[PDB]
């Protein structure tokens, strides 16, 4: 269970192949469920499963 900029949740993080644009901070699925997030420290994209 994690906390990115206050976005709290539970899941298993993984290296993401999603190419976030620079202004995008987190991702959302077909059903608006958050399924990716940019780590504010290292700025890498992490898939939330």
């Amino acid at each position: 269970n994690f906390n990115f900029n206050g976005l709290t949740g539970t899941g298993v993080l993984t290296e993401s192949n999603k190419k976030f644009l620079p202004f995008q901070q987190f991702g959302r699925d077909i059903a608006d469920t958050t399924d990716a997030v940019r780590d504010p420290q290292t700025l890498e994209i992490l898939d939330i499963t």
Partner: antibody, heavy 132, light 108 residues
Framework: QVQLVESGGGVVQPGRSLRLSCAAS????????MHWVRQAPGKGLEWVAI????????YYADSVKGRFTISRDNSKNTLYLQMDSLRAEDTAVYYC?????????????????????????WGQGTTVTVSS | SYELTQPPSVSVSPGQTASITCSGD??????ACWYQQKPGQSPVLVIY???KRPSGIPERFSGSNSGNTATLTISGTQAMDEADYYC???????????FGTGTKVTVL
Amino acid sequence: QVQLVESGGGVVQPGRSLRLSCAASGFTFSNYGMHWVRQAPGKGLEWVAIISFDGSNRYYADSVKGRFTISRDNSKNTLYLQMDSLRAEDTAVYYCAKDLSFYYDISTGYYPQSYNSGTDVWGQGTTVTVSS
Amino acid sequence: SYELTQPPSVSVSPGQTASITCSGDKLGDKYACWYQQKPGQSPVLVIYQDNKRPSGIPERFSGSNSGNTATLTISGTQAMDEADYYCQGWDRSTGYYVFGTGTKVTVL
């Protein structure tokens, strides 16, 4: 002060691997892309690789494509270059160079979408030699 | 394939104009930059965006680009110019940042 300092040089047998580390201070490292540029003895400079500000996009020169692997840690303000299968021609002094124009401002979100070409700040450079 | 060609060296006297050239098939369709590398020291940016000058560099440095040729030009040679100059074709979209063969300016 805006400075870059490299580390991790040495002598390596052919076919081995080595990882350089370039530390950055005096500026927001996470805002700028980073380059690796090497200069073999008595030869001109050659661009090694580039990495985006967040590490999503990377490009390599044809001489090192497939072998090398550039990476960065924006939280530690450090840049890395994993070399694999070092050859004789890889002997060169490796510099890490900062872009004159930052790709994206983390602090304010400023995303210019139009950037200058220069690389203003270069590091001191650490020698790497391949021999037996 | 791509590669930039520059003359091996150029000889110039103090006070005389020095013309330093770099050429390539797509060099003028791209922003080209120049770096001044003293012997044994790291390069120092001198010209970028084909005519722009970094802050603190003497105004006597200048450059231009057109067609297949990019050219760094010195209004007047001085004792600090003994170095090696390298051209770089720049393009963020293509990921094209290759350097040139360089050229040794010789203050005779």
